[PDB]
């Protein structure tokens, strides 16, 4: 009321900074850039440096680096040992006390990468919002991108916080992620969890929708504004073959967005459930029926036995801090059943 | 033109039908009906099957005390192997069920049905005048289904290795397969994972861009994408973008199906065991070695018999 | 193993090639391979499907 | 008593919406009942 709607007023330094930041340059710096480009940059470098030189001989008792003779698949950035528990492992913190070499040896670089990457993701989403605002468009892309942030937070931050320490978080690496995947299969029976089912359904349906939409649009073009492809022809085709076909373009292109986001959000909820060991592991009725009747046996029972084997044969080396030594007679075997 | 053949041909080939039939429909429809009927009936009620062929039946029918997540149609018994096992070659219906014939029946009818469906997808496209190769895009899931249900049993020499027609059975199949062969550490499965993830990414991103642009424009969305990431001026037209959308996942699934078929003949993934060795000959464990330990556990618990 | 795997992959790819080329050839012979004429759509000459 | 409310609106949803809703409820049911029974 006192003044006009912020038209000119005064050219404060903030206005000059804003004008410089939002210049139509080759790269849109924007306000979010001050948070995105630095952090994300380190989030990359910390990985690659992490993959190249530093070792995991003291945290996990493994060799994970090119310097030690590891392929691209094998190399990884290992999490800090379980003794470190939930320490953020600041380079200036008590654990490292400002010694960069020992900070690397203790495994703090994983925390560096994870934290800076999370803040980089936040900055990237803010950048999406900023550009959408600048071009006067609805920010549906940010809503879509919210899902991968949900998965990252649920897997790399919520999960280890729910467990003993950072040790059980995924380690950045192609083979390390495979180890983590088999680890969830062995202990938590992650495949059986309903939320993982509701996420995999979303992912596969998303791939299906992508393929079908590409093929349909590319195979109903008009000979050569107006839409290039014939919507009526495609609707007739898919309504006569499959039975149901889209009739509204906006609804179709919104469904293609709705599927993966829902799938990944539901998987993230499932991983949150696992973070507190709330795992859909067992069916009590089937277990008691198999116990009383040795003859009775289903695929579920075989999966449970396989999980027991995975745990028994992996815990020896995947969890060194436990100092587990299993006599050869104790390890499960199929023939001993 | 009132001849029985003429009117029947007009009815089948006509587009007036709610669901187009076509000549391919002639074999497509009955095959799928037989497959789904036998599948439903077997899932609902069926006796235990001797999957491993050593007189240790495995319950898989819903009515015999197991859940939806656990119920499955057990594959054919190991004793028969690749021999053709209809009803009439079986000694009796009860023995046929005990050995696990209905899985073989279902899989044969299903493969025929899916192939005929792929064909009709071209035939109708030819009728309407649209371009013909939507079937090519459909060849990916068909190829994967053929690899899972037919090619892998052929390679392993027995029909008991086919994927059980159930959820927990599918998980068991995947775990056992990872145990026998390093499916995870194989480049073609890596390409399949890349294809699936990229398909999800592209579907989400394309939906977001198009739905945001639809206000009352495509130039604005193109500029949005160009400014967001450093990349500029790609997929300038809808034709290239919508071709790329179809090309990525289809190639990914083609490659994963080919990887499965390749493993059917015992050509496993990468084997990085004892890859790193220190001086004077010791073994330094790497993530591949922990994966190997997990595989050891899976495989040793898989061998039910001595 | 090498022979079987390589030749299965090549046979499958050449089958996909048959599908593609046969479809394209039939469409070109029919005359609507370039695209729909945007004036005389065969679908428009059909009644609404209810 | 107050005057009639000006911003009174009515909710609508067509047959597609009903089919989507029913299919969602039934799919969630078939998925989760297996674990509810346990």
């Amino acid at each position: 009321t006192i003044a006009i709607g912020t038209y000119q007023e005064k050219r404060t330094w903030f206005d000059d900074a804003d004008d410089w930041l939002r210049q139509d340059r080759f790269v849109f710096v924007g306000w979010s850039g001050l948070l995105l480009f630095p952090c994300a940059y380190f989030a990359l470098g910390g990985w690659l440096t992490g993959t190249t030189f530093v070792t995991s001989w003291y945290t996990h008792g493994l060799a994970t680096s090119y310097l030690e003779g590891c392929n691209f698949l094998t190399a990884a950035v290992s999490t800090p040992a379980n003794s470190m528990a939930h320490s953020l492992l600041f380079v200036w913190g008590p654990e490292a006390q400002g010694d960069f070499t020992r900070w690397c040896q203790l495994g703090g670089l994983w925390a560096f990468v994870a934290l800076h990457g999370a803040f980089g993701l936040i900055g990237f989403m803010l950048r999406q919002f900023e550009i959408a605002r600048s071009v006067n468009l609805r920010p549906y892309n940010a809503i879509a991108f919210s899902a991968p942030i949900a998965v990252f937070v649920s897997v790399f931050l919520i999960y280890p916080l729910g467990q003993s320490g950072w040790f059980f978080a995924p380690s950045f690496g192609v083979a390390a992620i495979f180890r983590f995947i088999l680890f969830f299969q062995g202990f938590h029976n992650w495949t059986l969890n309903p939320f993982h089912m509701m996420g995999v359904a979303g992912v596969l349906g998303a791939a299906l929708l992508c393929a079908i939409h590409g093929a349909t649009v590319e195979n109903t073009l008009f000979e050569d504004a107006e839409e290039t492809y014939s919507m009526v022809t495609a609707n007739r085709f898919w309504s006569q073959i499959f039975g149901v076909a889209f009739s509204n373009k906006r609804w179709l292109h919104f469904f293609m967005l709705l599927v993966p986001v829902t799938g990944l959000w539901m998987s993230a909820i499932g991983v949150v459930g696992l973070a507190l060991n709330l795992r859909a592991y067992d069916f009590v009725s089937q277990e008691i029926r198999a116990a009383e009747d040795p003859e009775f046996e289903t695929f579920y029972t075989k999966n449970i036995l396989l999980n027991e084997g995975i745990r028994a044969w992996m815990a020896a080396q995947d969890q060194p801090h436990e100092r587990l030594v299993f006599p050869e007679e104790v390890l499960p075997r199929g023939n001993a059943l | 033109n009132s001849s029985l053949w003429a009117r029947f041909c007009e009815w089948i080939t006509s587009t007036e039908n709610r669901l187009y039939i076509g000549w391919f429909g002639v074999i497509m429809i009955p095959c799928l009906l037989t497959a789904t009927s036998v599948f439903i009936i077997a899932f609902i009620a069926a006796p235990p099957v001797d999957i491993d062929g050593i007189r240790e039946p495995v319950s898989g029918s819903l009515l015999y005390g197991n859940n939806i997540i656990t119920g499955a149609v057990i594959p054919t018994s190991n004793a028969i192997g690749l021999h053709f096992y209809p009803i009439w070659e079986a000694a009796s219906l009860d023995e046929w069920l005990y050995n696990g014939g209905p899985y073989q029946l279902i899989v044969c009818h299903f493969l025929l049905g899916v192939y005929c469906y792929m064909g009709r997808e071209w035939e109708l496209s030819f009728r309407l005048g649209m371009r013909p190769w939507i079937a090519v895009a459909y060849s990916a899931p068909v190829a994967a289904a053929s690899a899972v249900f037919l090619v892998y049993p052929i390679g392993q020499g027995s029909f008991s290795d086919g994927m059980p027609l159930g959820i927990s059975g599918t998980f068991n199949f995947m775990i056992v397969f990872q145990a026998e062969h390093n499916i995870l550490m194989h480049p073609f499965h890596m390409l399949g994972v890349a294809g699936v993830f990229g398909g999800s990414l592209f579907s989400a991103m394309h939906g977001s861009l198009v739905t945001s642009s639809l206000i009352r424009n495509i130039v604005a969305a193109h500029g949005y994408f160009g400014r967001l990431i450093f990349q500029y001026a790609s997929f300038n037209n809808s034709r290239s973008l919508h071709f790329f959308l179809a090309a990525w996942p289809v190639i990914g699934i083609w490659f994963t199906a080919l990887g499965l078929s390749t493993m059917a003949f015992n050509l496993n993934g990468f084997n990085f065991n004892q890859s790193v060795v220190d001086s004077q000959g010791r073994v330094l464990n790497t993530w591949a070695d922990i994966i190997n330990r997990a595989n050891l556990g899976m495989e040793v618990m898989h061998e039910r018999n001595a | 193993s090498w022979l079987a795997c390589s030749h299965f992959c090549l046979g499958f790819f050449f089958f996909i090639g048959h599908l593609w080329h046969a479809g394209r050839a039939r469409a070109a012979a029919a005359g609507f391979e370039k695209g729909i004429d945007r004036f005389d759509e065969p679908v428009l000459s059909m009644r609404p499907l209810d | 008593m107050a005057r009639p409310n000006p911003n009174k609106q009515v909710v609508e949803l067509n047959r597609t919406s009903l089919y989507w809703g029913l299919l969602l409820i039934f799919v969630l049911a078939v998925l989760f009942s297996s674990y509810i029974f346990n």
Binding site: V244 | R18 | - | V30
Partner: peptide, 28 residues
């Protein structure tokens, strides 16, 4: 009796599919 519950859920779902196929609403 859980079997009857599972079967009811399955056949109900198939019924929804059938109605969505054959009883479509003509748009607008």
């Amino acid at each position: 009796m859980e079997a009857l519950v599972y079967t009811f859920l399955l056949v109900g779902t198939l019924g929804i599919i059938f109605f969505s196929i054959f009883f479509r609403d003509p748009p607008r």
